[PDB]
Assembly symmetry: C3
């Protein structure tokens, strides 16, 4: 019994001068790789992430483009093989989510935790 | 955990909407969601935003599935306490939107799930 | 209620073995492999485990072998629908069996398979 996280971030096409969904995915992947490595150096907690392309739909009156905004969804699980303290991991995820929000220049960002039963095959 | 998230899975109906990419499929469903979400928001004052992911759904070829799977879209969203006073009314709104999305996409079936989640909202 | 379980599996696509060259092509690769192992299991036990599959990249430390910006992966998910499932525990055992078959067939060294509580509303 453990936790997974899910983060939803915009890609900020204009600030990063990207022009394809795959460039935005490679952008966020590289940014996560850098900040997860830094946090691992500090705390020995490495937060790996599975990143998926997406579009997020909300009201055009509140800033959404027609048909939605390009986004990345990042998800990962606390693996007991690597994580001894679920609370420290969860605090680490929250720090990383805030740092991703800052580096991606996002005005808002969601970070969820969901209970999950992990079967790890090695 | 302290709120709910939903997940809906829908086909993209290339036979009816005559689309031919992952982009035009996300654009189609996203534009449709944006319209039905706004319509429900006007009626109920509950706006349900959605995160839309490209996918394929794999099932038995003898039940209609193409080889390697049917093109689909996965829609997710979370009830944010800053926007949602009443989680049961939000749940009923999501279900109403799911049935409406099924109708607009001309889907024979459609799944809608609710999962408990703990939301941290940074603004 | 509709109280049930969903599974989530994360698999690499093993470009060194299958040599796919795009995300759409590795999605079709994993989709075909799942289709065939789900079919075999359905013929034997009458439990068909469908899967939604999503393209993705998985980010971990390059020190441990991750490519820059992430490794190409596929996420597979599915949910036990009480209209088809007679025994949720047998469904769960079947998912685990299929996940291990997928691991073997994709020649993955490691693979995660999660179960998450969910409430399914099924419209037909
Ligand atoms: N459901 C809502 N009800 C009422 N008001 C809303 C709602 N959504 C947005 N608003 C209003 O719109 C304005 C923007 O608010 P945001 O919170 O940034 O609005 C959100 C949500 O609508 C939606 N969204 C984000 N994460 C999720 C998720 N996990 N699931 C589903 N939808 C998601 O996408 C928007 C952010 S879009 C990506 C972030 C953006 N590039 C940035 O720089 O901030 C603000 O004025 C809000 O009051
Ligand atoms: N698991 C099963 N076991 C036994 N019989 C099944 C099963 N699935 C389908 N059938 C048979 O096929 C008939 C059609 O059933 P459907 O429910 O439409 O079968 C489903 C599921 O097999 C699969 N699927 C849908 N949602 C999900 C999800 N969230 N996770 C995993 N898989 C998903 O994909 C199919 C729908 S595919 C997209 C919808 C379709 N374009 C349409 O217009 O209806 C049904 O009446 C049964 O006879
Ligand atoms: N988080 C970590 N903390 C510490 N050490 C780690 C961590 N991850 C990997 N390592 C080290 O690297 C070695 C390999 O470990 P793996 O378990 O294979 O490392 C994992 C995880 O880091 C990550 N990953 C996989 N599934 C998930 C998921 N659901 N959510 C988030 N991330 C996921 O991706 C890697 C697998 S990449 C795909 C599988 C691979 N092609 C293969 O053939 O095995 C391991 O022995 C450790 O020494």
């Amino acid at each position: 019994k453990t936790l997974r996280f899910e983060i939803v971030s915009g890609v900020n096409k204009g600030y990063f001068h990207t022009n394809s969904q795959s460039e935005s995915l490679d952008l966020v992947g590289g940014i996560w790789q850098k900040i997860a490595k830094e946090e691992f150096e500090k705390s020995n907690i490495y937060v790996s992430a599975v990143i998926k392309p997406s579009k997020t739909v909300y009201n055009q009156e509140w800033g959404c483009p027609e048909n939605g905004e390009e986004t990345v969804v990042l998800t990962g699980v606390a693996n007991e093989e690597f994580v001894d303290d679920i609370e420290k991991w969860k605090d680490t995820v929250i720090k990383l989510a805030k740092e991703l929000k800052n580096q991606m220049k996002q005005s808002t960002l969601t970070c969820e935790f969901i209970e999950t039963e992990l079967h790890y095959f090695k």
